[PDB]
Design a protein around this ligand. Structure first.
Ligand SMILES: Cc1cc2c(cc1C)N(C[C@H](O)[C@H](O)[C@H](O)COP(=O)(O)OP(=O)(O)OC[C@H]1O[C@@H](n3cnc4c(N)ncnc43)[C@H](O)[C@@H]1O)c1[nH]c(=O)[nH]c(=O)c1N2
Ligand SMILES: Cc1cc2c(cc1C)N(C[C@H](O)[C@H](O)[C@H](O)COP(=O)(O)OP(=O)(O)OC[C@H]1O[C@@H](n3cnc4c(N)ncnc43)[C@H](O)[C@@H]1O)c1[nH]c(=O)[nH]c(=O)c1N2
Ligand SMILES: [Cl-]
Ligand SMILES: [Cl-]
Ligand SMILES: [Cl-]
Ligand SMILES: [Cl-]
Ligand SMILES: [Mg+2]
Ligand SMILES: [Mg+2]
Ligand SMILES: [Mg+2]
Lengths: 413, 413
């Protein structure tokens, strides 16, 4: 098993690296092998058909052409149709959400001096700690309570998420979803690189790598235990920092002066025999609540879902572990209390799907190149986490641009 | 959470343990939790639809009512219909297969004095080493070449496998398969155990266990990374010796005076537009050949498959890893040579499925109890590998019987 070029990771980053390399005249005649530990490409892009009826996004779900121009361009390039993503305003504005908008405006002159303190400590200047907790909780993203998220970071974060962007008057961002699922873009890239001669080995997990003369020897394991050795001349690891850390490549110290973190994410989707929420004018609305569901979305008349992070993602995953019936009963209870509705008036679902992402969002904990190189071995690393767009598909696209240029440089050396 | 009784492993052994325990009046009122690292029960019983048409067995495939009475009784108990397994004679015997029958008969008076030497060394007494290799290879089970398989053991092995049992005049054994797949029996046991109150947590891998007072604390990991702790008062590990060795319970030293081994297995199934093998009168026949396919089976007019162990299982898994196209081409090459027909006359398949089992058969290497106990902790271990029926579902049923009695004794103490 040998190749000129090897890419480990068949998410949007790795597949886009492959696209850029195969487009280069400098890679004519070179063989390209792509590994992924999963049996399908896409990584944290994961589209499914809910009850075989509606397409849902278990992973990445939305993008903005204003914020994410490379993604918009890729959707157009592969003829993937977009649709409006409807969850961009908060119709049922609560007092504490209105208050946070006022507080963030009133406090903004203090960002120059005090903007490096935590968002929680900063917002506490408005009316005290307790009022700040109530206000921040109403944004629905529990990461905003982290001590390491500064006020200046949080102001940026709030303005780039569609549900809460009005809180910093960032309403000019439009938000789109995929008409057929972002998996269609993944499959478009995969089919393009395969037509250009890439060979795919899905279901193989890279365990270790070592330099082999001017190349590398990779040790992988199939998901049935089969041990595989692969030799390559040039290597991109298009996997996130948590995955790099599981390898034997001295990540992160040999690659940058930075530390990386991650947070868990959870999504749950439910579909019902009737669109019972139409009676309450909830179609295409999102509710943000002081309640373990946190963010509750009603998609037209098709389905509902909720989206949580950090401790509440872990709460829902623990519930799942205790059993399906208790999990569905807990959703029913929290929906009733969020909607001010009789628990009996919330029906039971016909079908549901959920997904827990242990490292759903990854990020640098601290300047930083968009792709990295191992100081000794020349292996290249590619991930949204190395960019200003960490946690967005746009970031993978940007990292892929840099990673492909670094690999071309090595090839031409 | 917690349980009175916990079983790790939901193959036929673990499920049968649960059934026996839940049938006991001594377990009234007790809670029972069952973990398995896979998302479905069954273990090495794995039934699948080939091209959605016919049911095939990627794992265990046949049993004999004469050799395996508890399995026949379980099929009847759960109303699972059996059908004749056709591959019980060699219609197209080679000369070397005929010669091995003569050799084993002519040498049998030497078994008393010399039966503990290797099968290879013993058969070499007939016409020398080279003739013995030719004869033994023609049985199609490469394990027969191991130095640790004695002549006494091999005579027993040959007489209990359907394709070659005529070599030792064991034609009285009938052989059956499941009309709908042995997965139906697994699901029967599962439904019975679930009705009786057992709770299933599938997709959780046991990582480690330690004693905790009068019970145990289990560390498990979901296949999405979720880490889970479980407390129980009584524990059966219904997993094979290879899986025991991966835990932290000092297997095998703390459990038995014996050592355990394993061999890989591989099955490949192919379906075609036409039953082309009918022209050679091969329907419902098996050929055993000196080529990597080893044992080639033609099932009516429905499909063909091959079944290999040891180095040839690894040969095929390596082929799979190099690519689907090269794997199918290799099958076509070896099929042509085995049938003595030209390669072009072998059509290309419509659909195919395969399965590599890294530890497909597990066995004791060396008066062995049918279930084991940890000398200190009281944990119980259950597996076909601890019985005189290692490698057969019957052995799981026998080990389950003993392991359930060992647990009831612990409960009633
Ligand atoms: C719940 C949720 C919600 C969102 C998002 C994610 C999640 C989980 N995101 C972020 C988006 O999903 C993310 O930025 C990109 O998909 C990451 O692409 P990569 O290819 O860099 O990594 P990604 O993690 O997708 O791919 C890495 C690949 O490497 C493989 N791998 C890892 N280790 C390996 C090994 N050792 N051997 C072999 N293979 C290995 C993995 O199997 C995986 O396929 C998002 N973005 C956005 O734009 N809009 C949004 O709405 C959201 N929302
Ligand atoms: C290719 C092939 C062909 C045959 C056979 C097997 C194979 C692979 N067999 C043998 C038969 O399949 C075997 O004897 C029984 O299925 C074994 O049943 P057990 O429940 O003991 O183990 P089995 O291995 O089935 O179950 C063990 C369970 O433990 C789980 N597990 C392991 N470690 C774990 C951990 N750490 N945490 C959680 N879960 C864990 C596994 O996922 C699995 O579900 C057979 N027999 C026969 O009668 N007739 C035949 O024709 C053949 N032929
Ligand atoms: Cl795919
Ligand atoms: Cl993740
Ligand atoms: Cl012959
Ligand atoms: Cl196995
Ligand atoms: Mg990738
Ligand atoms: Mg079992
Ligand atoms: Mg004989």
């Amino acid at each position: 098993q040998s190749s000129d070029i090897c890419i480990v990771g068949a998410g949007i980053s790795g597949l886009t690296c492959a696209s850029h390399l195969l487009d280069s005249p400098a890679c004519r005649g070179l063989s390209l092998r792509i590994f992924d530990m999963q049996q399908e490409a896409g990584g944290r892009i994961r589209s499914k058909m809910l009850d075989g009826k509606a397409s849902i996004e278990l992973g990445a779900g939305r993008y903005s052409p204003q914020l994410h121009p490379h993604f918009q361009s890729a959707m157009q390039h592969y003829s993937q149709k977009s649709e409006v993503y409807p969850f961009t305003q908060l119709k049922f504005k609560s007092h504490v959400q209105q208050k946070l908008k006022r507080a963030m405006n009133e406090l903004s002159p203090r960002l120059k001096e005090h903007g490096k303190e935590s968002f929680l400590q900063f917002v506490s200047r408005y009316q005290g700690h307790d009022s700040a907790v109530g206000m921040i909780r109403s944004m629905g993203y529990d990461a905003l309570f982290l001590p390491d998220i500064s006020a200046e970071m949080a102001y940026d974060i709030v303005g780039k998420h569609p549900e809460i962007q009005s809180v910093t008057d960032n309403d000019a961002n439009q938000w789109f979803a995929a008409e057929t699922g972002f998996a269609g873009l993944i499959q478009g890239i995969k089919a393009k690189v395969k037509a250009a001669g890439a060979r795919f080995s899905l279901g193989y997990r890279l365990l270790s790598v070592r330099t082999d003369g001017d190349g590398y020897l990779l040790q992988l394991a199939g998901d049935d235990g089969w041990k595989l050795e692969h030799r390559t001349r040039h290597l991109i690891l298009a996997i996130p920092p948590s995955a790099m850390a599981g390898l034997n490549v001295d990540f992160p110290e040999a690659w940058s002066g930075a530390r990386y973190g991650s947070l868990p994410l959870f999504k749950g989707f439910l579909t019902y025999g009737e669109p019972w929420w139409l009676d309450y004018k909830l179609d295409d609305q999102v509710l943000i609540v002081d309640n373990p569901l946190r963010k509750i979305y009603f998609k037209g008349d098709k389905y509902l879902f909720f989206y949580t992070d950090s401790e509440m993602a872990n709460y829902w995953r623990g519930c799942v572990a205790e059993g399906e019936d208790g999990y569905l009963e807990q959703i029913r209870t929290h929906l009733a209390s969020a909607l001010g509705i009789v628990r009996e008036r919330i029906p039971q679902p016909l079908a549901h799907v959920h997904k827990y992402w242990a490292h759903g969002v990854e990020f640098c904990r601290d300047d930083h190149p968009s792709a990295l190189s191992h100081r000794d071995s020349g292996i290249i690393a590619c991930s949204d986490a190395y960019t200003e767009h960490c946690g967005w598909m746009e970031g993978g696209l940007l990292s892929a641009r840099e990673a492909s240029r670094l690999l071309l440089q090595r090839i031409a050396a």
